[PDB]
A paper describes a structure:
In addition to Mpro, coronaviruses encode an essential papain-like protease (PLpro) within non-structural protein 3 (nsp-3). In this study, we describe a novel chemical scaffold that targets the essential coronavirus protease PLpro, with low nanomolar activity against SARS-CoV-2 PLpro and other pathogenic coronaviruses. Our structures collectively reveal how WEHI-P series compounds achieve their high potency through exploiting an unexpected PLpro binding site, expanding PLpro drug discovery to a new chemical scaffold.
The replacement of the central ketone group with an oxime led to WEHI-P2, with a submicromolar IC50 and with micromolar cellular activity in a FRET assay and was further elaborated to introduce a cyclohexanol group to generate WEHI-P3. Moreover, co-crystals with WEHI-P2 in the same space group failed to explain the significantly improved IC50 achieved through oxime incorporation; the oxime group, installed to engage the BL2 groove, did not form protein contacts and was poorly defined by electron density.
Residue numbers in the entry: 2 to 220, 231 to 308
């Protein structure tokens, strides 16, 4: 009997040595099987597959535990959806722009590129090891896996239209933000002392205005005390002037012909508009901004 040695895994951390009969398909021996995102279930082993690592679906307690510990989800479809996305994201190009990893436009990924750029400029501790590992690989230039995971965790497929604010929110909900806090106080002369506190993910997000200067000053009138490493402000896309040094980064959204497109503006020594692979540098920027991110120092 002709056989080769392969490795199976669900996390690419614990590798399980397996002997495969080249006469049988991977699906008959392991079940649904993947190589770098490609479904090889109906494929028989090639000699080139010797010593390669293959993803399989967790069909036993050992693989289930390893999967849950690594991904922090029980969704049985997660790994399949992750692999399906990876087979595309691995083919995307990831150019370095101004020291930041970006994505060349493909499969309507402007929102992912903009999120990827933003994530590199804020300090975030993910709870799932899968995200934390891919996060640091993405910051180093290898972001194909991180992008595939974002798609999987957000229940979005390659090519699906997406929203940066949504994507950031759902990723924040897989992060440790327990120390973040936003204390709100009612501004009144007759109501006395009225305060409520938002803790966790709610404290790092706000919808309604883009300016932190205004948000801090007011809103009935509410005084705000913000204690978070970062804050994301979102508002309907409208013409908005981005002044250098007054923000960290921002998302621009254009809706020409109801076909959306995102660009990323970051504030470095000057303003940089990163549109996928494209880069435009300006001292001033006016555009239809919809998200602005601010960092604590
Ligand atoms: C015309 O786009 N309007 C948008 C929008 C509308 C109301 C908002 C109200 C807000 O606070 C009250 C805060 C943000 C808001 C944003 C987003 C802009 C970004 C792109 N999205 C698209 C929707 C599907 C794909 C992406 C749509």
């Amino acid at each position: 009997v002709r056989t080769i040695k392969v490795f199976t895994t669900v996390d690419n951390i614990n590798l399980h040595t397996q002997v495969v009969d080249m006469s049988m398909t991977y699906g008959q021996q392991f079940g649904p099987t993947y190589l770098d995102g490609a479904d090889v279930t109906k494929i028989k082993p090639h000699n080139s597959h010797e010593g390669k690592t293959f993803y399989v679906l967790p069909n036993d307690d050992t693989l289930r535990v390893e999967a849950f510990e690594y991904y922090h989800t029980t969704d049985p479809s997660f790994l399949g959806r992750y692999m399906s996305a990876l087979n595309h994201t691995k083919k995307w190009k990831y150019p370095q722009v101004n020291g930041l990893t970006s994505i060349k436009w493909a499969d309507n990924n402007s929102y992912l590129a903009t999120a990827l750029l933003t994530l590199q400029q804020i300090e975030l501790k993910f709870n799932p090891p899968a995200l934390q590992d891919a996060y640091y690989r993405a910051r180093a230039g290898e972001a194909a896996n991180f992008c595939a995971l974002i798609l999987a965790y957000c229940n979005k497929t390659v090519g699906e239209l997406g929203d940066v604010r949504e994507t950031m929110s759902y990723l924040f909900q897989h992060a440790n933000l327990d120390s973040c806090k936003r204390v709100l106080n009612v501004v009144c002369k007759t109501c006395g002392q009225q305060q409520t506190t938002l803790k966790g993910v709610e404290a790092v997000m706000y919808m309604g205005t883009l300016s932190y200067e205004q948000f801090k000053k007011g809103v009935t009138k509410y005084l705000v005390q913000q204690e978070s490493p970062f804050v994301m402000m979102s508002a309907p896309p409208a013409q908005y002037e981005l002044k250098h040094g007054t923000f960290t980064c921002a998302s621009e959204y254009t809706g020409n012909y109801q076909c959306g497109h995102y660009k990323h503006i970051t504030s470095k020594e000057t303003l940089y508009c990163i549109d996928g692979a494209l880069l435009t540098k300006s001292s001033e920027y006016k555009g239809p901004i919809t998200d602005v991110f601010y960092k604590e120092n």
